[PDB]
Each structure stands twice: as C-alpha cells, then as structure tokens.
C-alpha cells in the first residue's frame, strides 16, 4: 500500500531524504551528442540534456539533434518521448519530430510565459487564418479548432508535410493551470487532464509515443508520466500493490535525466498515483 507509505513520508516529513536517495540512485549515461558545440543554440538548459541511447534523431543527415529522449516502459507498453519546451530556433525541428515519429498528441505542462519571462516559444498557431510555415523542416501547420476549458485546453491542429503534401491532425494538450511555483494543490483536475489525453487514443499504440514537454521536459512532464505508467500498471498486475512508485521512477530515469525535480513534486506524484487509483480502480 504507498497511500500508507505516503502517510508514513507526510507524518515523519521524510520527503526530502527520499527524493534525495532517488537522486543518488538515478541512472547515469553520456550526452555526448548533446554537447557538441554545434548544438549549443540547441538546448534551452545546459544542465538538461537527453543521453545519447535514448535520444530522439532527427530524420536528416544534417544534423539530427534535438534535445529530446523516448521513454520506453516495456512492461507498462507504454513509450513517450519527452523534450523541451521547443526554442525560437527549433520549432520546425520539434514539428519535424512530431511528424517523424508519427505522434498523435503533444502534451504541454507550462504557459508560454511564467513569472513573467518566456519558458516556451509560441510553437502553434493561435488563429485559424494564421497557419505557421517552419520553412528549415519544410512544415505547415494550422489551427483547425481550439476547446478552452477551465484547467485546460485541447486543439485541433492540421500538421502537413508540404515536401509531400501528406497532412496528419495533431491533438495539443495544454494543461494551463500549473502553479508559477510549487505544485497543484489536488491531483483532481492534474488526473482529468490525463485521462482525457489518454481518451484521444494520443497515448495509444496504434500510435506513435506521445510528445510531452514543459521547459526543461523533466519535472513536471516526468509527473504526467509517472502517473500515467503507475496507473496502468496497478491495471495490469493481478496485485496493484505491488507498483512500486520510486522504482517506476528510477526505471524512467534510465531514459531521461532527473525526472521530478523536487520533493514536492514527487509527494504530488504520490497524490496523483494515489487519488488516480480511487477512481481508476472501479
Ligand atoms: C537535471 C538537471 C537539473 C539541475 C538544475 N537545473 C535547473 O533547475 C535548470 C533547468 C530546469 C530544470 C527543471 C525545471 N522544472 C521542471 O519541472 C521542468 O521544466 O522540467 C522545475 C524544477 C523545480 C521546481 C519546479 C519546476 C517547474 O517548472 O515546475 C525547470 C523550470 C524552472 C522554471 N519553471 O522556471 C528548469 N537549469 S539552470 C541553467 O540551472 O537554470
């Protein structure tokens, strides 16, 4: 049982020593590719860099970097590829890795603007008769249709391989609620947010994995899947109790560097897994 684990971490306020002992156990692997000089304009962190197993290539003998990685749950079968929130620079790069990867949604976690600076370029067209051309990967995109709710909101949009004419239509996910700091207070409209990703068939195999990034593309879309994959897995195994959250995540660290960033981040982890299991379970 982890909501009596999580009782145990709240009572004795061990958050922060756990979180820690993850860290000191996460995964290690080069990111070579990630920083060459050439790629410097690249990434938006330079502390956050995909490795070189798990990152995404670019189809073109160019160069085919782009700071993003493919998780791959194998027991969960489950795959997402995690990124950055795209730079000014590299959203034809981003959109050429949607196509490439044949992804049917693109989930975002943060706002354009937080804080009052940019943690994202503005890589989708706001108006239907504005598309946007990213002439570098040769892509068009258009807004079809955009559904505003209150904690978020989903679009409709057309993406098309002008080189081949051949159009595809992408879901975008934007959860615009995130807190400018913390966390969520409820996992409540964090967890319908996911389930009405997962209802769009986005995260489906029939599909390729699913694009999910905020600015870094490690804490708060390490959450987002973390949860989805725990999720799933207590459906799976004939004793859900047995999913063991710190050991998903350190399985998911494999893939990508410092999934969850912080202790709060990690305990609202727990509260989305916990509270997505009251209602998930039946
Ligand atoms: C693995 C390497 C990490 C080393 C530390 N590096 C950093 O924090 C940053 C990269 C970095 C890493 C994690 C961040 N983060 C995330 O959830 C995220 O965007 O992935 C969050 C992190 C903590 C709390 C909240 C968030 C958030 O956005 O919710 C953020 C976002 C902060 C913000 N909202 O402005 C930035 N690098 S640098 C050059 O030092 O600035």
């Given at each position: 049982?982890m909501?009596?684990?999580?009782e145990?971490?709240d009572?004795?306020?061990?958050?922060?020593?756990?979180?820690?002992?993850?860290?000191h156990?996460?995964?290690?692997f080069?990111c070579?590719v990630?920083?060459?000089?050439?790629?410097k304009?690249?990434?938006?962190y330079?502390?956050?860099?995909?490795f070189?197993?798990?990152?995404?290539?670019?189809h073109?003998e160019?160069?085919?970097?782009?700071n993003?990685?493919?998780?791959?749950m194998?027991?969960?079968?489950r795959?997402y590829?995690?990124?950055?929130?795209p730079?000014p620079?590299?959203?034809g790069?981003?959109?050429?890795?949607?196509?490439?990867?044949?992804?049917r949604?693109?989930?975002?976690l943060?706002?354009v603007?937080?804080?009052?600076?940019?943690?994202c370029?503005?890589?989708?067209?706001?108006?239907?008769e504005?598309?946007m051309?990213?002439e570098?990967?040769?892509?068009?995109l258009?807004?079809?249709?955009?559904?505003?709710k209150?904690?978020?909101?989903?679009?409709?949009?057309?993406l098309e391989?002008?080189?081949?004419?051949?159009?595809?239509?992408?879901?975008?996910?934007?959860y615009?609620?995130?807190?400018?700091?913390?966390?969520?207070?409820?996992?409540a409209?964090?967890?319908?947010?996911?389930?009405?990703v997962?209802?769009?068939?986005?995260?489906?195999?029939?599909?390729?994995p699913?694009?999910?990034h905020?600015?870094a593309?490690?804490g708060?879309?390490?959450?987002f899947?973390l949860?989805?994959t725990?999720?799933?897995?207590?459906?799976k195994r004939k004793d859900?109790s047995?999913v063991?959250?710190?050991?998903v995540?350190?399985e998911?660290?494999?893939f990508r560097?410092?999934?969850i960033?912080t202790?709060?981040?990690?305990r609202?982890?727990?509260?989305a897994?916990?509270?997505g299991?009251?209602?998930?379970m039946?």
């Open positions: 049982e909501e009596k684990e999580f145990q971490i009572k004795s306020g061990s958050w922060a020593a756990i979180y820690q002992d993850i860290r156990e996460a995964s290690d080069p070579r990630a920083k060459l000089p050439k790629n304009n690249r990434n938006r330079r502390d956050v860099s995909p070189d197993h798990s990152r995404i290539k670019l073109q160019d160069n085919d970097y782009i993003a990685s493919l998780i791959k194998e027991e969960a079968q795959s590829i995690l990124t950055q929130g730079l620079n590299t959203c790069h981003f959109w050429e890795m949607v196509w490439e990867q044949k992804s949604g693109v989930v975002m943060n706002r603007m937080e804080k009052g600076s940019l943690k370029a503005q890589y989708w067209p706001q108006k239907e504005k598309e051309i990213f570098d990967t040769n892509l068009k258009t807004l079809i249709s955009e559904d505003i209150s904690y978020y909101t989903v679009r409709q949009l057309e391989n002008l080189t081949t004419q051949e159009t595809r239509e992408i879901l975008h996910f934007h615009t609620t995130w807190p400018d700091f913390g966390v969520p207070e409820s996992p409209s964090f967890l319908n947010f996911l389930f009405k997962r209802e769009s068939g986005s995260l489906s195999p029939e599909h390729g699913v694009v999910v905020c600015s593309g490690i708060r879309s390490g959450t899947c949860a989805d725990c999720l799933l897995l207590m459906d859900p047995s063991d959250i710190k050991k995540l350190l998911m660290r494999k560097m410092g999934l960033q202790a709060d981040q990690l609202f982890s727990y509260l897994v916990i509270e299991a009251k209602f998930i039946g």
